[PDB]
mmCIF file of C-alpha atoms in Angstrom:
data_model
loop_
_atom_site.group_PDB
_atom_site.id
_atom_site.type_symbol
_atom_site.label_atom_id
_atom_site.label_comp_id
_atom_site.label_asym_id
_atom_site.label_seq_id
_atom_site.Cartn_x
_atom_site.Cartn_y
_atom_site.Cartn_z
ATOM 1 C CA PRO F 1 11.040 18.209 14.707
ATOM 2 C CA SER F 2 12.613 15.259 16.496
ATOM 3 C CA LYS F 3 14.129 11.762 15.916
ATOM 4 C CA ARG F 4 11.817 9.277 14.106
ATOM 5 C CA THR F 5 13.938 6.360 12.788
ATOM 6 C CA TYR F 6 11.897 3.964 10.575
ATOM 7 C CA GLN F 7 11.771 2.542 7.033
ATOM 8 C CA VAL F 8 8.954 2.346 4.487
ATOM 9 C CA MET F 9 7.838 0.014 1.768
ATOM 10 C CA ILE F 10 5.258 1.307 -0.662
ATOM 11 C CA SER F 11 3.243 -1.316 -2.491
ATOM 12 C CA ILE F 12 1.277 -0.187 -5.535
ATOM 13 C CA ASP F 13 -1.596 -2.084 -7.092
ATOM 14 C CA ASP F 14 -1.114 -3.525 -10.576
ATOM 15 C CA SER F 15 -4.540 -5.247 -10.925
ATOM 16 C CA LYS F 16 -7.207 -4.753 -13.579
ATOM 17 C CA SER F 17 -8.755 -1.784 -11.796
ATOM 18 C CA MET F 18 -5.568 0.103 -12.454
ATOM 19 C CA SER F 19 -6.268 -0.237 -16.136
ATOM 20 C CA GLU F 20 -7.873 3.155 -16.149
ATOM 21 C CA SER F 21 -5.117 5.685 -16.767
ATOM 22 C CA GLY F 22 -6.335 7.858 -13.948
ATOM 23 C CA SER F 23 -5.547 5.118 -11.423
ATOM 24 C CA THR F 24 -2.118 4.161 -12.616
ATOM 25 C CA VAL F 25 -0.949 7.647 -13.370
ATOM 26 C CA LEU F 26 -1.987 9.206 -10.163
ATOM 27 C CA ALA F 27 -0.788 6.318 -8.006
ATOM 28 C CA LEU F 28 2.633 5.970 -9.569
ATOM 29 C CA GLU F 29 3.206 9.568 -10.405
ATOM 30 C CA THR F 30 2.253 10.565 -6.904
ATOM 31 C CA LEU F 31 4.678 8.115 -5.454
ATOM 32 C CA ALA F 32 7.198 9.717 -7.751
ATOM 33 C CA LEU F 33 5.981 13.252 -6.839
ATOM 34 C CA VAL F 34 6.490 12.489 -3.262
ATOM 35 C CA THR F 35 9.777 10.845 -3.736
ATOM 36 C CA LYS F 36 11.022 13.692 -5.961
ATOM 37 C CA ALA F 37 9.714 16.461 -3.675
ATOM 38 C CA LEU F 38 10.636 14.546 -0.536
ATOM 39 C CA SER F 39 13.594 15.088 1.655
ATOM 40 C CA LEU F 40 14.067 11.376 1.644
ATOM 41 C CA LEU F 41 16.518 11.612 4.485
ATOM 42 C CA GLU F 42 18.414 9.194 6.702
ATOM 43 C CA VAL F 43 15.375 8.994 8.958
ATOM 44 C CA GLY F 44 13.972 6.385 6.574
ATOM 45 C CA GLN F 45 13.988 5.370 2.910
ATOM 46 C CA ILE F 46 11.412 4.043 0.501
ATOM 47 C CA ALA F 47 11.376 0.621 -1.131
ATOM 48 C CA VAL F 48 8.775 0.104 -3.830
ATOM 49 C CA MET F 49 6.856 -2.955 -4.958
ATOM 50 C CA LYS F 50 4.280 -3.417 -7.726
ATOM 51 C CA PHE F 51 1.598 -6.014 -7.445
ATOM 52 C CA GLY F 52 -1.073 -7.674 -9.437
ATOM 53 C CA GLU F 53 -1.711 -11.366 -9.792
ATOM 54 C CA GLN F 54 1.798 -11.543 -8.322
ATOM 55 C CA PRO F 55 4.132 -8.989 -6.659
ATOM 56 C CA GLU F 56 7.231 -7.538 -8.292
ATOM 57 C CA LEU F 57 9.881 -5.635 -6.417
ATOM 58 C CA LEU F 58 10.525 -2.498 -8.350
ATOM 59 C CA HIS F 59 13.386 -1.472 -6.191
ATOM 60 C CA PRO F 60 15.114 -1.800 -2.739
ATOM 61 C CA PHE F 61 15.102 1.039 -0.213
ATOM 62 C CA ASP F 62 18.478 2.424 -1.278
ATOM 63 C CA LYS F 63 18.369 1.400 -4.909
ATOM 64 C CA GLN F 64 16.767 4.402 -6.492
ATOM 65 C CA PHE F 65 18.938 6.425 -4.285
ATOM 66 C CA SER F 66 18.825 9.321 -6.712
ATOM 67 C CA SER F 67 15.524 10.908 -7.618
ATOM 68 C CA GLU F 68 16.829 10.790 -11.183
ATOM 69 C CA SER F 69 16.753 7.052 -11.087
ATOM 70 C CA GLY F 70 13.073 7.514 -10.251
ATOM 71 C CA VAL F 71 12.672 10.116 -13.031
ATOM 72 C CA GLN F 72 13.581 7.532 -15.600
ATOM 73 C CA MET F 73 12.629 4.336 -13.830
ATOM 74 C CA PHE F 74 8.996 5.092 -13.439
ATOM 75 C CA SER F 75 8.911 4.196 -17.178
ATOM 76 C CA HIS F 76 11.209 1.245 -16.520
ATOM 77 C CA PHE F 77 8.547 0.085 -14.125
ATOM 78 C CA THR F 78 5.529 0.970 -16.229
ATOM 79 C CA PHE F 79 2.491 -0.787 -14.700
ATOM 80 C CA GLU F 80 0.323 -2.714 -17.085
ATOM 81 C CA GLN F 81 -1.000 -0.083 -19.496
ATOM 82 C CA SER F 82 -4.160 -2.092 -19.910
ATOM 83 C CA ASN F 83 -4.234 -4.190 -16.836
ATOM 84 C CA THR F 84 -5.966 -7.565 -16.686
ATOM 85 C CA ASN F 85 -4.851 -8.871 -13.289
ATOM 86 C CA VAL F 86 -6.353 -9.588 -9.882
ATOM 87 C CA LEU F 87 -4.698 -8.945 -6.599
ATOM 88 C CA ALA F 88 -2.990 -11.922 -5.187
ATOM 89 C CA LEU F 89 -3.183 -10.320 -1.794
ATOM 90 C CA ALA F 90 -1.742 -13.178 0.076
ATOM 91 C CA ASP F 91 1.342 -13.198 -2.114
ATOM 92 C CA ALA F 92 1.697 -9.488 -2.479
ATOM 93 C CA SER F 93 1.458 -9.259 1.211
ATOM 94 C CA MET F 94 3.843 -12.009 1.984
ATOM 95 C CA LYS F 95 6.396 -10.789 -0.551
ATOM 96 C CA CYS F 96 6.679 -7.292 0.725
ATOM 97 C CA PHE F 97 6.059 -8.467 4.237
ATOM 98 C CA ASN F 98 8.992 -10.704 4.222
ATOM 99 C CA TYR F 99 11.195 -8.639 1.933
ATOM 100 C CA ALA F 100 10.821 -5.132 3.188
ATOM 101 C CA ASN F 101 10.963 -5.988 6.769
ATOM 102 C CA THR F 102 13.760 -8.498 6.549
ATOM 103 C CA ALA F 103 15.795 -6.261 4.320
ATOM 104 C CA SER F 104 15.316 -3.311 6.630
ATOM 105 C CA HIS F 105 15.994 -5.427 9.692
ATOM 106 C CA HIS F 106 19.290 -6.725 8.490
ATOM 107 C CA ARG F 107 20.372 -3.845 6.241
ATOM 108 C CA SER F 108 20.580 -1.041 8.727
ATOM 109 C CA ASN F 109 21.364 -2.825 12.024
ATOM 110 C CA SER F 110 19.164 -0.312 14.009
ATOM 111 C CA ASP F 111 16.040 1.006 15.809
ATOM 112 C CA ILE F 112 13.714 1.047 12.847
ATOM 113 C CA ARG F 113 9.953 0.847 12.847
ATOM 114 C CA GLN F 114 8.665 -1.316 9.970
ATOM 115 C CA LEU F 115 6.027 0.441 7.896
ATOM 116 C CA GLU F 116 4.179 -0.759 4.819
ATOM 117 C CA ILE F 117 1.974 1.441 2.703
ATOM 118 C CA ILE F 118 -0.738 -0.265 0.809
ATOM 119 C CA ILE F 119 -2.065 1.416 -2.280
ATOM 120 C CA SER F 120 -5.038 -0.377 -3.804
ATOM 121 C CA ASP F 121 -8.631 0.356 -4.499
ATOM 122 C CA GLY F 122 -10.352 -1.840 -1.975
ATOM 123 C CA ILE F 123 -11.298 -5.400 -1.156
ATOM 124 C CA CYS F 124 -9.213 -8.136 -2.684
ATOM 125 C CA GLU F 125 -10.478 -11.234 -4.380
ATOM 126 C CA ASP F 126 -8.809 -13.261 -1.594
ATOM 127 C CA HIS F 127 -9.386 -10.804 1.278
ATOM 128 C CA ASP F 128 -10.247 -13.840 3.405
ATOM 129 C CA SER F 129 -6.430 -14.433 3.494
ATOM 130 C CA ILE F 130 -6.179 -11.506 5.847
ATOM 131 C CA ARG F 131 -6.982 -13.560 8.835
ATOM 132 C CA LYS F 132 -3.496 -15.044 8.538
ATOM 133 C CA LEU F 133 -1.771 -12.092 6.960
ATOM 134 C CA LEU F 134 -2.991 -9.969 9.834
ATOM 135 C CA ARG F 135 -1.981 -12.591 12.290
ATOM 136 C CA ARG F 136 1.508 -12.606 10.909
ATOM 137 C CA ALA F 137 1.849 -8.818 10.897
ATOM 138 C CA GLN F 138 0.639 -8.654 14.449
ATOM 139 C CA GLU F 139 3.124 -11.269 15.623
ATOM 140 C CA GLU F 140 5.958 -9.568 13.800
ATOM 141 C CA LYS F 141 5.164 -6.013 14.934
ATOM 142 C CA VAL F 142 4.674 -4.785 11.356
ATOM 143 C CA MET F 143 2.858 -1.500 10.866
ATOM 144 C CA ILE F 144 0.721 -0.865 7.818
ATOM 145 C CA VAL F 145 -1.162 1.949 6.107
ATOM 146 C CA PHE F 146 -4.132 1.347 3.843
ATOM 147 C CA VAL F 147 -5.077 3.754 1.174
ATOM 148 C CA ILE F 148 -8.286 2.634 -0.490
ATOM 149 C CA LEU F 149 -8.842 3.639 -4.159
ATOM 150 C CA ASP F 150 -12.543 4.387 -4.737
ATOM 151 C CA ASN F 151 -12.923 0.977 -6.459
ATOM 152 C CA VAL F 152 -11.318 2.722 -9.476
ATOM 153 C CA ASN F 153 -12.089 1.474 -13.070
ATOM 154 C CA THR F 154 -15.786 0.890 -12.280
ATOM 155 C CA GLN F 155 -18.669 3.327 -12.608
ATOM 156 C CA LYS F 156 -18.543 5.762 -9.682
ATOM 157 C CA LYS F 157 -21.932 4.387 -8.652
ATOM 158 C CA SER F 158 -20.242 0.982 -8.769
ATOM 159 C CA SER F 159 -17.156 2.130 -6.933
ATOM 160 C CA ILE F 160 -19.450 2.586 -4.025
ATOM 161 C CA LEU F 161 -21.718 -0.343 -4.594
ATOM 162 C CA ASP F 162 -18.958 -2.817 -5.329
ATOM 163 C CA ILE F 163 -17.629 -2.379 -1.776
ATOM 164 C CA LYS F 164 -20.937 -1.661 -0.103
ATOM 165 C CA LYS F 165 -22.474 -4.675 -1.796
ATOM 166 C CA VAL F 166 -19.998 -6.897 -0.039
ATOM 167 C CA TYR F 167 -21.251 -5.273 3.131
ATOM 168 C CA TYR F 168 -24.910 -5.640 2.088
ATOM 169 C CA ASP F 169 -24.317 -9.312 1.419
ATOM 170 C CA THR F 170 -22.444 -9.563 4.738
ATOM 171 C CA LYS F 171 -25.493 -8.388 6.571
ATOM 172 C CA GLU F 172 -27.718 -11.216 5.217
ATOM 173 C CA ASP F 173 -25.507 -14.204 4.699
ATOM 174 C CA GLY F 174 -24.288 -15.256 8.150
ATOM 175 C CA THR F 175 -21.449 -17.020 6.314
ATOM 176 C CA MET F 176 -19.922 -13.690 5.237
ATOM 177 C CA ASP F 177 -18.035 -11.018 7.129
ATOM 178 C CA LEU F 178 -16.850 -7.845 5.322
ATOM 179 C CA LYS F 179 -14.861 -7.051 8.430
ATOM 180 C CA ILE F 180 -12.045 -9.287 7.360
ATOM 181 C CA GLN F 181 -11.019 -6.826 4.733
ATOM 182 C CA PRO F 182 -10.964 -3.576 6.953
ATOM 183 C CA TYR F 183 -9.654 -5.875 9.752
ATOM 184 C CA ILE F 184 -6.148 -6.043 8.410
ATOM 185 C CA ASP F 185 -5.774 -2.377 9.387
ATOM 186 C CA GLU F 186 -5.699 -1.931 13.118
ATOM 187 C CA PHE F 187 -7.169 1.522 12.762
ATOM 188 C CA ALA F 188 -6.386 2.506 16.309
ATOM 189 C CA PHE F 189 -2.905 3.276 14.888
ATOM 190 C CA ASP F 190 -2.849 1.696 11.421
ATOM 191 C CA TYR F 191 -5.518 3.881 9.935
ATOM 192 C CA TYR F 192 -7.095 3.287 6.553
ATOM 193 C CA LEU F 193 -8.948 5.651 4.243
ATOM 194 C CA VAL F 194 -10.975 5.714 1.056
ATOM 195 C CA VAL F 195 -9.816 8.507 -1.219
ATOM 196 C CA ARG F 196 -10.694 10.263 -4.459
ATOM 197 C CA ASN F 197 -7.303 11.531 -5.450
ATOM 198 C CA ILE F 198 -3.771 12.488 -4.535
ATOM 199 C CA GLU F 199 -4.830 15.650 -2.792
ATOM 200 C CA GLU F 200 -5.901 13.654 0.237
ATOM 201 C CA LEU F 201 -2.272 12.712 0.711
ATOM 202 C CA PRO F 202 -1.495 15.631 3.118
ATOM 203 C CA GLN F 203 -4.054 14.099 5.485
ATOM 204 C CA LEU F 204 -2.361 10.805 5.291
ATOM 205 C CA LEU F 205 1.053 12.229 5.767
ATOM 206 C CA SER F 206 0.003 14.292 8.717
ATOM 207 C CA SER F 207 -1.890 11.491 10.441
ATOM 208 C CA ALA F 208 0.945 9.219 9.643
ATOM 209 C CA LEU F 209 3.363 11.817 11.000
ATOM 210 C CA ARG F 210 1.938 11.470 14.417
ATOM 211 C CA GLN F 211 2.275 7.738 14.098
ATOM 212 C CA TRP F 212 5.820 8.296 12.752
ATOM 213 C CA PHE F 213 6.309 10.327 15.906
ATOM 214 C CA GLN F 214 5.110 7.775 18.386
#
């Protein structure tokens, strides 16, 4: 291995689609599985935010310093058990955008890449907001990762159609452009991927590793 100084914020969806237990459990437990199994070394730490209709910081980078804090605090931070929210993308984005990056920037006084991991199931109700959110991230040199839930909490046939329908509509109505949602992810480096479950994480980590590298 070799030097890779950076810090990471992980933002986990707390909207209505997370109301199915499969979505919340796998997303939060996996973050916890990773964190617990992870040599969360000096190279970079993890800050975690929850977000629905509004973002909530669950904890700062160095707050749940001990994995034990995570062992108990995942319950402390239980996501809505029966979720009825929407994703206020613009706010969730600006909250972690400003917080994680500013905190990292000041906190460590060093050569740290700013990475944000986005865990959600797809297109947001206000995805149009991306044109500015993207703009801001670009200007500020902020790196992101987008993990797309298969439109969880909707019939599997609908997980597909809900997102493809936006595309289908995009094709006819010249007003519309699905691209704005995928757009936020500059996939040349800031790759995004639709997944079924937590076992696609090794792909992410590995792809991300090369981006962690350089």
